[PDB]
């Protein structure tokens, strides 16, 4: 319930005008690894409450956002700070590896 489902249009407000950190998961229904990381993202959203918003963007229903960031495939994670990309990860990760990524990305 802490996870935000973005559209191409709502991205322009909820991400670009937001101070704070937002982890955006670019995914699609056909993508197996994307679906598998979904429970990890739920856990992160709870654990990082007050620190990080977790958001998802379904690239087939929202084809405009990924090209703006040069995203070539899914799953891809973009960590925004204050409306700008602050870190990226292409590919799926274990929970422990995702937390390592976040330690570095939030620093
Ligand atoms: Cu919930
Ligand atoms: Cu939930």
Numbering used by the authors: 2 to 108
Question: What do the authors of the reporting publication say about this deposited model?
Answer:
Thioredoxins (TRX) are small globular proteins of about 100–110 residues, which are conserved in all living organisms. Two TRX forms were described in Escherichia coli, Trx1 and Trx22. The former, called EcTRX throughout this work, is a widely used experimental model for investigating the molecular basis of protein stability, folding and function.
The N106A variant was designed to eliminate a hydrogen bond linking the side-chain of Asn106 with the carbonyl oxygen of Phe102, thus N106A is expected to destabilize the native structure. The three-dimensional structure of this variant reveals that the hydrogen bond partner of Phe102 is now the main-chain of residue 106, through its amide nitrogen. These results are consistent with the very low effect on global stability (ΔΔG°NU = 0.3 kcal mol−1) observed for this mutation. The N106A mutant exhibits a large cavity of 166 Å2 for chain A or 130 Å2 for chain B. Electron density compatible with an ethanol molecule, used as a precipitant, was detected inside this cavity. More likely, the ethanol molecule establishes a hydrogen bond with Leu94. Therefore, we speculate that this cavity of EcTRX is highly dynamic, in such a way that it connects the protein core with the bulk solvent, allowing the entrance of the ethanol molecule. Another significant difference between wild-type and N106A is the distance between loop elements centered in positions 20 and 83, which results in the wild-type structure in a slightly “open” conformation (for instance, the distance from Cα 20 to Cα 83 is 7.4 and 4.3 Å for wild-type and N106A, respectively). For variant N106A, the drop was a 1:1 mix of protein (10 mg/ml) and reservoir solution (100 mM sodium acetate, 4 mM CuSO4, 25% ethanol, pH 4.25).
